[PDB]
From a paper:
In this paper, we present a strategy to fuse specific, high-affinity protein binders to obtain multivalent or multispecific scaffolds of predetermined geometry. DARPins are used as building blocks to confer the desired specificity to the construct. The two helices are not just joined end-to-end, but instead the two domains are made to overlap in such a way that the joining helix is stabilized by contacts with the domain cores along its entire length.
All 9 off7_Hxx_3G124 constructs were able to bind [name] and [name] simultaneously, demonstrating the absence of steric hindrance between the two targets, consistent with the structural models. Two DD constructs yielded crystals of the ternary complex: off7:[name]_H10_3G124:[name] crystallized in space group C2 (3.1 Å resolution, 3 complexes/ asymmetric unit (a.u.)) and off7:[name]_H11_3G124:[name] in space group P21212 (3.0 Å resolution). The structures of off7:[name]_H10_3G124:[name] and off7:[name]_H11_3G124:[name] confirm that DD fusions are capable of crystallizing with two target proteins bound simultaneously. In the complexes, the interactions between DARPins and target proteins were found to be very similar to the interactions seen in the absence of fusion partners.
Numbering used by the authors:
A (entry chain C): 2 to 64, 68 to 230
B (entry chain A): 12 to 324
C (entry chain B): 5 to 372
Write the structure that this text describes.
Amino acid sequence: SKGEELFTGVVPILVELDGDVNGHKFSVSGEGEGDATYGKLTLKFICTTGKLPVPWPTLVTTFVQCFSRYPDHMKRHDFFKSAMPEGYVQERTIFFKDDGNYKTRAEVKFEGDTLVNRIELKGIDFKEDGNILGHKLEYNYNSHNVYIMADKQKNGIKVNFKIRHNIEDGSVQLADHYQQNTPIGDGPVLLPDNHYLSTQSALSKDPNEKRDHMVLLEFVTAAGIT
Amino acid sequence: SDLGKKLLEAARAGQDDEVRILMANGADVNAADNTGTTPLHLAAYSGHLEIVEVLLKHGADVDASDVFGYTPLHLAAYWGHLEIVEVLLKNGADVNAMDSDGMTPLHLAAKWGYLEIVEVLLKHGADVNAQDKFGKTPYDLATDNGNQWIAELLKRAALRRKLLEAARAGHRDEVEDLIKNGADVNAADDVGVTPLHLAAQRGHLEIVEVLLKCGADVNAADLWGQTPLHLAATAGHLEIVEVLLKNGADVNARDNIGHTPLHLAAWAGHLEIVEVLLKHGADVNAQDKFGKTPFDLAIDNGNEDIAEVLQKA
Amino acid sequence: GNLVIWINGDKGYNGLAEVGKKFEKDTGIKVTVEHPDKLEEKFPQVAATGDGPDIIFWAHDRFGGYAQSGLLAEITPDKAFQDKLYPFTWDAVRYNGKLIAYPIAVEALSLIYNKDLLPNPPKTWEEIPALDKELKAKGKSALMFNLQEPYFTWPLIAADGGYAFKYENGKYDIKDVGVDNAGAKAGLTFLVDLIKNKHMNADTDYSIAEAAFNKGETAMTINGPWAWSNIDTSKVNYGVTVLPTFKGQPSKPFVGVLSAGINAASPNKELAKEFLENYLLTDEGLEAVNKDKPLGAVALKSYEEELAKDPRIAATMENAQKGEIMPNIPQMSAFWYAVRTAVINAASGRQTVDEALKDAQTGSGGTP
């Protein structure tokens, strides 16, 4: 099963996103490395256009599930690494409770030795008093379950999960992620049986960084099969 | 051609509005005159920011070399146009391009001592060790031209980058040598990583020993709260775990997520480390930011031989 | 008894006639002051074995060719007269250890700057790059001068030790050429840098340099005494000072000494020797010709100190004393071509400095 031998060790990661939210054009660049052996991502993100019109946490999902740790008995269900180096397309339609919605396309593929996640984004119908444009979300992230399922029609997987964005007042903003991945390569890919991924993320700030940035440590593991 | 000359002239003049009309006319963006100078070269030396932004949007060769080998980054760094340098590098400018005399943009910035430009060049990976035609590094030009501070800063940036690359590769003899030559053992890159972080993660025992005796902060924290003990647990280097613990490594240090080195040792499946951690007083009851003990992580990964020893509490 | 004298039109021939006409009044020998075209190339062939002018006026660089054929008479002034003139002036008329002519005036490039844009000019070449940014801030350049001809650029190349042909006791070693030494390299490299650094432009020539400084677009330039009449017409509050020093050494521009040679086939030579010695080379004699057309810096000290009142002239004299005499041997013709191609290629990046200089060293008949 070639394509997984590329994630045996540490792999550098580059992330470039160019998006639009209510006309607030912006672009962001993240760098780092990820270790699929432990589902570990060691990344840092920098907004190149100055300030972000939306809070950093709202984009954590959009900013490489191939690094998610797969137990040796679920390697048959590792759709991400089986799609490499050709890569896979990632399309999401995130619904923010009582607010607008992002709509993303991204190509997670290998460019040289490193893995890149080129992303397009468009957010619409966000209220200026909303929790997004109001920067009312806390600078933190929760743990979630990413439920993967197979879509026989698209020759790819379907993924659905809700994400809890903490609010400063104490409430919660939910973001319904309706995700659809398809492979770029015209070859064989192992479509998995229904299961889920468990995510852990923590957000920090570089004290020696003046630009609008986000430091993220993320751990992910796959489960649901014996 | 004529339209070529118009764009070169418009770039030197700085008429932002005249260029846009010229671009809509399909004017060759990489057009070069006799000297090989392109509209992007002139805008950089002149200092026009808005023109550079548009020229790059239209696919201007950011690494174009004139007859002398100079590139747009040479001039922008030379003439002290920080905003120009920052944007040029963002669009993939060769940070170590060399002219016919082997002079990088760092050589030029060190001559004139533009600190703010040297910092951005170093941050983007400038080869401080690069040698010009005359056997002079940018550090040599900083001293001859009288900028002794940037010389020290250039010297420092050289040793840390050399030192981290010495630990990551695993060359013991070199690490010992660099420290003799003033290499800061507590030197940290943009990532917060120190030579000890890499010596532990990579698994070079002898290097870890050396760094520690030279005052290496064993509890050094990168931007994700990770400590060489965290990295040694995830990787599974038993000897390294014992060494760090003997030199005062905080056995309950927490990364940004809240994982101790015990959480991580239970994550990867390194039993022998779990014992040493507990032997040195690892809080088995400790939980991460999400209330997960190292036990909960052991059962989730399906390595109960760990949970069994954690069941002992 | 006749005296036929030739001199170029742009030089003062009206005032020379006054001195000649005054000489007619004391000796009864007619003095014809004529200014015909092509007097330099026509003299060696017309008067070799025929009737020619008894005295001739022209830069010393040509007397090397005239002396090679021996068409100019050997002149011997007494020690009392030799001391009236500056010592270095005789070296221009010195050929094979022998003297050929009387030096009259001296010309050499000097630093011309705009006092308005820059009251205190730079004393060292190393100051221009820093000064250029300070002036480029206001849309004006610091230095701008002719780069196509080596005669204008040479003072910087030769500053640190460069030399065309070693001059020893009136004789040049033709085998030894000095356009490859470190001094020329160290110098020219700095010149190329200024172009490489966008401080100057390789295509810069005489006209735009004059126009730029005359229009106030640039604050400095390098030129000879001949461009003064055009600057004062431009009304730029200009000045003249010593050329800046590079590597501690003073810039070495080539010096052109207008000299007066005596024809070998002249029926009256002793009486003609007296005219130049006792009548032309005096305060009143040189003053007469100076009123017609200015000669700039002069060889005779008593009249130079009177002209030293003008710093523009005294400035030219300062460079001349520090500069190098222009060799009069004919091999210079190949020196100009070989050196011209070197600066043009190194300035346009067509060839590296070392490659350009070594190709010029051989091109001038030298050994590296």
